[PDB]
Amino acid sequence: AMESLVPGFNEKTHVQLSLPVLQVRDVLVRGFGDSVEEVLSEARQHLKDGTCGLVEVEKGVLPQLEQPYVFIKRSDARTAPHGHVMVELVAELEGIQYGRSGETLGVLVPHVGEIPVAYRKVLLRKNGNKGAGGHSYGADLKSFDLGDELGTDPYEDFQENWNTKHSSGVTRELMRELNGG
């Protein structure tokens, strides 16, 4: 069950994405922001509008991308429709893995314009997901652990509802760089 396509997946919990695959060579603006909070927010918002490209070309792309970057990681190494891949968002600074949850398809890199080399259909979690710190803590990794996508911080009553996300007045002061200070 579900490993071979979830029979009737909820589009209200999982959103169907059709993303253009970029090569790092062509990627304009090779990062979302300076802080993990920003990049996860930029990930979700640009995925819907199609203003985000997906890098799933090679591995040499990634060391040439700007941190924090957001990879598209399967929630399970299983759980995939025929053509669609069920995934979720994870942002990472050093590229250190601490809960890949499966395979990484692509990197989310903003699309200003550029020739796609491939296209990918992935299903992104609208809610119930993310691991920008470490599910297994990366085995005493001690990372920043910032699953707080700027406004949609799911530890303060917020239920991770980025639908109609107006995080304008969430900018206290130090909302720049993973190293706020």
- Asked whether residue 166 is domain-assigned, the answer is no
Q: Which residues, in sequence order, are CB contacts of 74 under 8 Å at separation 6+?
A: 80, 85, 86, 87, 88, 101, 102, 103, 104, 105
- Asked whether residue 24 is domain-assigned, the answer is yes
Hey, what are 160's tokens? Answer: 């991770």
- Asked whether residue 49 is domain-assigned, the answer is yes
Residue pair 106/119 in contact (Cβ under 8 Å)? The answer is no
Residue pair 92/54 in contact (Cβ under 8 Å)? The answer is no
- Asked whether residue 107 is domain-assigned, the answer is yes
Hey, what are 58's tokens? Answer: 């090679």
Range of the domain at 110: 15-125
- Asked whether residue 3 is domain-assigned, the answer is no
Hey, what are 100's tokens? Answer: 């890949």
- Asked whether residue 120 is domain-assigned, the answer is yes
Residue pair 151/165 in contact (Cβ under 8 Å)? The answer is yes
Alpha helices in 15-111 (DSSP H): 36-49
Alpha carbons 149 and 170: distance in angstroms, whole number: 11
Please tell me the experimental approach by which this structure was elucidated. NMR
Residue with tokens 């997946």: 9
For residue 80, what are the CA distances in angstroms to 11, 53, 146?
Answer: 15, 21, 27
Alpha carbons 34 and 73: distance in angstroms, whole number: 21
DSSP lists the bridge partners of residue 87 as 74, 124
Residue pair 38/181 in contact (Cβ under 8 Å)? The answer is no
- Asked whether residue 93 is domain-assigned, the answer is yes
Q: Cis check for the bond before 68: say yes or no (omega within 30 of 0).
A: yes
Which CATH number goes with the domain that contains 59?
A: 2.30.30.1000
Entry field: residues in the chain: 181
The 10 Å Cβ neighbour count of residue 135 is 12
Closest CA to 44 of 95, 110, 92, 100: 110
- Asked whether residue 76 is domain-assigned, the answer is yes
Domain count, the chain: 1
Hey, what are 75's tokens? Answer: 């929630």
Alpha carbons 5 and 20: distance in angstroms, whole number: 23
DSSP lists the bridge partners of residue 73 as 88, 104
